[PDB]
Amino acid sequence: PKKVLTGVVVSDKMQKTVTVLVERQFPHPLYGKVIKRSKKYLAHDPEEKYKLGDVVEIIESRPISKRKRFRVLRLVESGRMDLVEKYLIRRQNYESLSK
Amino acid sequence: RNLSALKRHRQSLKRRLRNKAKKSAIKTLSKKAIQLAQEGKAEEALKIMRKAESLIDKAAKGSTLHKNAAARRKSRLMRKVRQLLEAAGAPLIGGG
Amino acid sequence: MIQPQTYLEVADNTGARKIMCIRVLKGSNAKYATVGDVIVASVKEAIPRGAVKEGDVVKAVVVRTKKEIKRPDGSAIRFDDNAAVIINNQLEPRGTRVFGPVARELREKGFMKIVSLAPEVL
Amino acid sequence: MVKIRLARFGSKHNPHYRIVVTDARRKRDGKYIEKIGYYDPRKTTPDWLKVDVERARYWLSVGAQPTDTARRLLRQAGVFRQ
RNA sequence: CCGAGGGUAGGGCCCGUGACUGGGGCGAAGUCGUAACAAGGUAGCUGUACCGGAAGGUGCGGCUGGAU
RNA sequence: AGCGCCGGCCAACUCCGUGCCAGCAGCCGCGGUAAUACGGAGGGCGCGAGCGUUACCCGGAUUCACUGGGCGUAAAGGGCGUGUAGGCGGCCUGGGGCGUCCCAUGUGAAAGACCACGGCUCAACCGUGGGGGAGCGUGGGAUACGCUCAGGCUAGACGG
RNA sequence: UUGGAGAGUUUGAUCCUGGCUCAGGGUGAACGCUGGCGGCGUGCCUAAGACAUGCAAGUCGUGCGGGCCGCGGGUCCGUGGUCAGCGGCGGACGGGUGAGUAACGCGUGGGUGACCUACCCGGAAGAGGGGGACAACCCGGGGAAACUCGGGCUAAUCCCCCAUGUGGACCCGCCCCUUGGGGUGUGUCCAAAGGGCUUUGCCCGCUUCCGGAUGGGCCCGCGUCCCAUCAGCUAGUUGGUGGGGUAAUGGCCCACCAAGGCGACGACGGGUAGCCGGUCUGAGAGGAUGGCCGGCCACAGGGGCACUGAGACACGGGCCCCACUCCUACGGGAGGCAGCAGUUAGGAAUCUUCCGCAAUGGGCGCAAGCCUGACGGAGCGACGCCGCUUG
RNA sequence: CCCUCGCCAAGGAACUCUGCAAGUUGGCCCCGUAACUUCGGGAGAAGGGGUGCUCCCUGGGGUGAUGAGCCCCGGGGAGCC
Ligand SMILES: [Mg+2]
Ligand SMILES: [Mg+2]
Ligand SMILES: [Mg+2]
Ligand SMILES: [Mg+2]
Ligand SMILES: [Mg+2]
Ligand SMILES: [Mg+2]
Ligand SMILES: [Mg+2]
Ligand SMILES: [Mg+2]
Ligand SMILES: [Mg+2]
Ligand SMILES: [Mg+2]
Ligand SMILES: [Mg+2]
Ligand SMILES: [Mg+2]
Ligand SMILES: [Mg+2]
Ligand SMILES: [Mg+2]
Ligand SMILES: [Mg+2]
Ligand SMILES: [Mg+2]
Ligand SMILES: [Mg+2]
Ligand SMILES: [Mg+2]
Ligand SMILES: [Mg+2]
Ligand SMILES: [Mg+2]
Ligand SMILES: [Mg+2]
Ligand SMILES: [Mg+2]
Ligand SMILES: [Mg+2]
Ligand SMILES: [Mg+2]
Ligand SMILES: [Mg+2]
Ligand SMILES: [Mg+2]
Ligand SMILES: [Mg+2]
Ligand SMILES: [Mg+2]
Ligand SMILES: [Mg+2]
Ligand SMILES: [Mg+2]
Ligand SMILES: [Mg+2]
Ligand SMILES: [Mg+2]
Ligand SMILES: [Mg+2]
Ligand SMILES: [Mg+2]
Ligand SMILES: [Mg+2]
Ligand SMILES: [Mg+2]
Ligand SMILES: [Mg+2]
Ligand SMILES: [Mg+2]
Ligand SMILES: [Mg+2]
Numbered sequence A: 001p002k003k004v005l006t007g008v009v010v011s012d013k014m015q016k017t018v019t020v021l022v023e024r025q026f027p028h029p030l031y032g033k034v035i036k037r038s039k040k041y042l043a044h045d046p047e048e049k050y051k052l053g054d055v056v057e058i059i060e061s062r063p064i065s066k067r068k069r070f071r072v073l074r075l076v077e078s079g080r081m082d083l084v085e086k087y088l089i090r091r092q093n094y095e096s097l098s099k
Numbered sequence B: 001r002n003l004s005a006l007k008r009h010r011q012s013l014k015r016r017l018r019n020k021a022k023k024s025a026i027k028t029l030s031k032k033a034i035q036l037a038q039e040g041k042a043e044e045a046l047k048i049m050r051k052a053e054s055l056i057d058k059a060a061k062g063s064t065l066h067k068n069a070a071a072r073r074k075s076r077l078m079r080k081v082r083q084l085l086e087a088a089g090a091p092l093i094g095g096g
Numbered sequence C: 001m002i003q004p005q006t007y008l009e010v011a012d013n014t015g016a017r018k019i020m021c022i023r024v025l026k027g028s029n030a031k032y033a034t035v036g037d038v039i040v041a042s043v044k045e046a047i048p049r050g051a052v053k054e055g056d057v058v059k060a061v062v063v064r065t066k067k068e069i070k071r072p073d074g075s076a077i078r079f080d081d082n083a084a085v086i087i088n089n090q091l092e093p094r095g096t097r098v099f100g101p102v103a104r105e106l107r108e109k110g111f112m113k114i115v116s117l118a119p120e121v122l
Numbered sequence D: 001m002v003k004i005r006l007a008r009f010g011s012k013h014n015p016h017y018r019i020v021v022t023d024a025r026r027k028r029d030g031k032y033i034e035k036i037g038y039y040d041p042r043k044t045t046p047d048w049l050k051v052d053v054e055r056a057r058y059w060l061s062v063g064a065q066p067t068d069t070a071r072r073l074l075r076q077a078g079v080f081r082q
Numbered sequence E: 001c002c003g004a005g006g007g008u009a010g011g012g013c014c015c016g017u018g019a020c021u022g023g024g025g026c027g028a029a030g031u032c033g034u035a036a037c038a039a040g041g042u043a044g045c046u047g048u049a050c051c052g053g054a055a056g057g058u059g060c061g062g063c064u065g066g067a068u
Numbered sequence F: 001a002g003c004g005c006c007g008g009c010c011a012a013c014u015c016c017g018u019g020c021c022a023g024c025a026g027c028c029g030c031g032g033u034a035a036u037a038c039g040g041a042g043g044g045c046g047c048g049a050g051c052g053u054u055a056c057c058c059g060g061a062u063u064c065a066c067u068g069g070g071c072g073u074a075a076a077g078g079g080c081g082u083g084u085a086g087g088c089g090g091c092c093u094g095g096g097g098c099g100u101c102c103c104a105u106g107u108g109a110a111a112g113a114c115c116a117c118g119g120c121u122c123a124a125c126c127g128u129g130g131g132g133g134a135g136c137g138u139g140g141g142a143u144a145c146g147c148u149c150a151g152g153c154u155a156g157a158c159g160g
Numbered sequence G: 001u002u003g004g005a006g007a008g009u010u011u012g013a014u015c016c017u018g019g020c021u022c023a024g025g026g027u028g029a030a031c032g033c034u035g036g037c038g039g040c041g042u043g044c045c046u047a048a049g050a051c052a053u054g055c056a057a058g059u060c061g062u063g064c065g066g067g068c069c070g071c072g073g074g075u076c077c078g079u080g081g082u083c084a085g086c087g088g089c090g091g092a093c094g095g096g097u098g099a100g101u102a103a104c105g106c107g108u109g110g111g112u113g114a115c116c117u118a119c120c121c122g123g124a125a126g127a128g129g130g131g132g133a134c135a136a137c138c139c140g141g142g143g144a145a146a147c148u149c150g151g152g153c154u155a156a157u158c159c160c161c162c163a164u165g166u167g168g169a170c171c172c173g174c175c176c177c178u179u180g181g182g183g184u185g186u187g188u189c190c191a192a193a194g195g196g197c198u199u200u201g202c203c204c205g206c207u208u209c210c211g212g213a214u215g216g217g218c219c220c221g222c223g224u225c226c227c228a229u230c231a232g233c234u235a236g237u238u239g240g241u242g243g244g245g246u247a248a249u250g251g252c253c254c255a256c257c258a259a260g261g262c263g264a265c266g267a268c269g270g271g272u273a274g275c276c277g278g279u280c281u282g283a284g285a286g287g288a289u290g291g292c293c294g295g296c297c298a299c300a301g302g303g304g305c306a307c308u309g310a311g312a313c314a315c316g317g318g319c320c321c322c323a324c325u326c327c328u329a330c331g332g333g334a335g336g337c338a339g340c341a342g343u344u345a346g347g348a349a350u351c352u353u354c355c356g357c358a359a360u361g362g363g364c365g366c367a368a369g370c371c372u373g374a375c376g377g378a379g380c381g382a383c384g385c386c387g388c389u390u391g
Numbered sequence H: 001c002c003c004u005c006g007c008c009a010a011g012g013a014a015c016u017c018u019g020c021a022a023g024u025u026g027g028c029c030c031c032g033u034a035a036c037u038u039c040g041g042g043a044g045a046a047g048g049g050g051u052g053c054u055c056c057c058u059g060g061g062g063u064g065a066u067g068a069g070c071c072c073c074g075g076g077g078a079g080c081c
């Protein structure tokens, strides 16, 4: 099937495109423990209906642009700005990891 | 120091001529009709546009155009002419 | 009309790019070298790992010059640069290719090997 | 065309073919589409020939082309019997 | 138009090498002393600072991983 | 029929020669006039159209430790707080079923490896059959625990 | 539950910590001493340095017209061989190598309503009528060769033109679907080549369409080494609109617009490496590895480029630039073994300039058959394993 | 012959105590710019591109009035010698 993923929109600042962050868990292949890893997908939104904070599903799709190979499947939840915080604060810490 | 690969290069040069010549014409005509369709001039646009389409499919008989190119050139040819005549109408022949 | 201080292009593949004339080998006090004349030169610029390197004092035969050379048949020929081919003491090129045309004058002066290796002779 | 033929296994002075369906453009002993039987030319065992007959008929229907010396080992197992 | 590359000019990283120079390892058949190990003959060690041929010394503060 | 070895590790011991020399050496170490440790010899041990050396890989190495180590004095607690991300988190009830677990099914090529048999006089080599797998897709299920959402609590925490 | 041994060495002695060392298995090996036979393997790991000579891709006269020779016998016809040429089909496979690449390259599972597929098979229908070019050959000029210039003529399964329309293509509307999927209506557009025999019948070809099969392109999830003494990176950059391009999606390319995209879950940078099935070891977990065999990729003296084509941006095809070498008659030309052997350099070190198309396989052909350094075998080497001898 | 001045083949500092003298460079706009640093600078570093005229489209300002005219600061396209 077309791969389907669920995540938070962290950017709406492109026209007709959202950045959807998809998260996942898996055991460490040696140390066993369950670990999280995340990844941003540029998802096609022809309708500019998806907002910052939406939790959405995206479905692998024929390529729309370089880097966009997913369209937005549907709304799941709205107003998860707490997730968007988690991401945004993390990027803001990066200014403090340099020299 | 020899080969019939020579033969095969000898031939490619000749097929190259026939091809290029065919493709040249298609663009000359398509653009001609598109030009007409802009200032349309509807009967004439349509008239030349037919001459194009014929030549395109003629090219798709051989190695010149793969069928889908012919399809594609035709599709874009037609779309342009029609939508151009929308800025004044109306279709004097066919078509369609 | 090459004289001490004149920079010449080197038209071979010895690795030398540019040489500065330091002497014209034509008797005790010749003022100028032309086509077919041998100079002694300093290597002022060379590419890495060639037969010859910057600082080397080499010999070279001038093979084309920016001052036109005149001919007994009333004509003259003129090149866009002054160029020389590096040689050894038996007037043989130390390189194995020569780039650009050379002057036919080279032949009558026994730079036979250079004359043949040359893409053109004018 | 896709072909039905003889991939040599076994070893030196010791042939052992796998009658097999593969693309003609493959190398002899290369990845084949499907195995459908074997053939010991030196005949050194009771069944020096085995052929799934039900299968070979499929590929033929669908356009496979057997080699000469495979056509035979298909005759011998009567894949051709009308 | 783009374009292999060529040419001009200025940058970045890396390797090799260099008069001379800084210590380091080692060797051991030397010179000078004897700083540490005993209260090691001024308890030692310490961060820092100044100083001395050299181990080192002294000052300030700290530690006991100090004998009596 | 050769090659290595015979101080210990490590299986195999005596004579001569030498005298901190000549030399051996993987580690520990042998040699300074009675050396099973050097060189030869007799003898012995080990393998055998081979034996031995050098190089490199894994092993022994739980000596990077997931299985399976550690940090007062052996190497090892940050000079001390505050705190971002992260990692982790009390009792009770439900909803969801992401982790997790089970069943089905597709995939998991061939060769190789593993078990059976068989062909080259054996074997090596080679052939025929068998056994599976992790891991990913699909469908169905479970809901203890971890997760998530929702509603309660007071033993943690904070406040009066 | 088929599976797990340890020893020497820090002290006068002890216990502990801790490093060094050894016994084991392995190899594309190499070196020494020694060396009889056979089988299966197996053999340039270094300079992806440079290469003398042969050979590694051609085939069909059942597409065509010609010369040259001969056989047949009354200038010509026939028939045969040969040699080009025009015309197919192959040459994109098969063989080499591992340079580059840390990437959707590979592995694994998926997506294509975004796609192609020669020859092969199944099924639907069809081959009417005209005209033309260029070689070969004749004739002129130019070279030492490579070689070519121009004038003229002639055939065809070569090229073109109209006709025909099962069908197919394209725009617009409509219905089902749901990314560009399937059907329909109007308009427009597109087919063809014949050869041969036993000759009112076959065979091989030719044409357009549908579906199969097979091989591919593109796309996505997850996996894939060392250095953070590399911490910030990005202007076709990230998205958009329109268009160009392709078989097809896509900043793949362009024009315009917006200000975005990425990064401690390690971007960017440097280094190293083709990846897998596997292999080796290890009780296992792990570690190490990718030679031979199979799968994929990449490359073809170093670069760029497209032509031809179903398919190539083509190892033994083309164009251009570079480096190098050679030939010459000194005017001018040629080449690309990382195909098989072979030479040289380098190195501790790695093979016969063998034989054959008999077998398997591939190409062309109705077929006989021709070619095949793929392959089948033979040669050298104790390189490995296995067997056997010196009783 | 001297002064002040213009040009010069090939060369290009070989002149001389010394490039002395004379060349070169040269405004503006844009790109771009190193060591080192007292973080200001070094900097106009260096180096490079542009520069005329014609036509067409177009942005902002001043004065008007909000418009015309006038004046100011531009942008994009196609051309000509
Ligand atoms: Mg787009
Ligand atoms: Mg041919
Ligand atoms: Mg034109
Ligand atoms: Mg076509
Ligand atoms: Mg084409
Ligand atoms: Mg120098
Ligand atoms: Mg450029
Ligand atoms: Mg450049
Ligand atoms: Mg160039
Ligand atoms: Mg020194
Ligand atoms: Mg020194
Ligand atoms: Mg003291
Ligand atoms: Mg003392
Ligand atoms: Mg004291
Ligand atoms: Mg002190
Ligand atoms: Mg003193
Ligand atoms: Mg003092
Ligand atoms: Mg204190
Ligand atoms: Mg031994
Ligand atoms: Mg032993
Ligand atoms: Mg013993
Ligand atoms: Mg002695
Ligand atoms: Mg003795
Ligand atoms: Mg010993
Ligand atoms: Mg002894
Ligand atoms: Mg052990
Ligand atoms: Mg371990
Ligand atoms: Mg080890
Ligand atoms: Mg542990
Ligand atoms: Mg420990
Ligand atoms: Mg300590
Ligand atoms: Mg503390
Ligand atoms: Mg601190
Ligand atoms: Mg927190
Ligand atoms: Mg949590
Ligand atoms: Mg809990
Ligand atoms: Mg719950
Ligand atoms: Mg679940
Ligand atoms: Mg399974």
Ligand SMILES: [Mg+2]
Binding pocket: none
């Ligand atoms: Mg298998």
Ligand SMILES: [Mg+2]
Binding pocket: none
């Ligand atoms: Mg048996």
Ligand SMILES: [Mg+2]
Binding pocket: none
């Ligand atoms: Mg088997």
Ligand SMILES: [Mg+2]
Binding pocket: none
């Ligand atoms: Mg198993």
Ligand SMILES: [Mg+2]
Binding pocket: F143
């Ligand atoms: Mg529950």
Ligand SMILES: [Mg+2]
Binding pocket: none
């Ligand atoms: Mg709650």
Ligand SMILES: [Mg+2]
Binding pocket: F155
């Ligand atoms: Mg409480």
Ligand SMILES: [Mg+2]
Binding pocket: none
């Ligand atoms: Mg000791």
Ligand SMILES: [Mg+2]
Binding pocket: G010
């Ligand atoms: Mg001690």
Ligand SMILES: [Mg+2]
Binding pocket: none
């Ligand atoms: Mg002792």
Ligand SMILES: [Mg+2]
Binding pocket: none
């Ligand atoms: Mg120990």
Ligand SMILES: [Mg+2]
Binding pocket: none
């Ligand atoms: Mg040997």
Ligand SMILES: [Mg+2]
Binding pocket: none
């Ligand atoms: Mg020997």
Ligand SMILES: [Mg+2]
Binding pocket: none
């Ligand atoms: Mg190699």
Ligand SMILES: [Mg+2]
Binding pocket: G049
């Ligand atoms: Mg070299």
Ligand SMILES: [Mg+2]
Binding pocket: G049, G050
């Ligand atoms: Mg060489």
